């Protein structure tokens, strides 16, 4: 990344050389990931405000 820039994308990042139309395939994983912060989790996975 170029410092202080916002990546606004929806297209699926090509892993394993897979042209995907937002779809799955041979190791074609979703470009986004959502933190699974289960409430009252462990310290190493507790959420922090930064």
């Amino acid at each position: 990344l170029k410092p202080f820039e916002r990546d606004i994308s929806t297209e699926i990042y090509q892993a394993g050389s897979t042209p995907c139309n937002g779809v799955e395939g041979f190791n074609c994983y979703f470009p986004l990931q959502s933190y699974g912060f289960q409430p009252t989790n462990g310290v190493g996975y507790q959420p922090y405000r930064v």
Binding site: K2, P3, F4, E5, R6
Partner: protein, 99 residues
């Protein structure tokens, strides 16, 4: 649609266009770049005398505006606005006779 977050508007509104075809006596310069994501635009204006070519001399440029755009930049296009009266049969997208 808008889908936008940033705004910077100053409106000391005043009208002066003076549609003319005479020799150019008003010249503007704008220089655009970015460092660390801070987009910097430097601005200047000066009067000249030549009519057709570029007046070759020496001048200065000073910064005017800075923004925290934080966005990938690859392309740019300028903006132009011209529409004629009922006289021109060619519509706005079609015809114009004041270039």
């Amino acid at each position: 649609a808008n889908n936008c977050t940033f705004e910077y508007v100053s409106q000391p509104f005043l009208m002066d266009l003076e549609g003319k075809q005479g020799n150019f006596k008003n010249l503007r310069e704008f220089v655009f770049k970015n460092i660390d994501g801070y987009f910097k635009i430097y601005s200047k204006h000066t009067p000249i005398n030549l009519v057709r070519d570029l007046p070759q001399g020496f001048s200065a440029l000073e910064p005017l505006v800075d923004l925290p755009i934080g966005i990938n930049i690859t392309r740019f296009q300028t903006l132009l606005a011209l529409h004629r009266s009922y006289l021109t049969p060619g519509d706005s997208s079609s015809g114009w006779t004041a270039g």
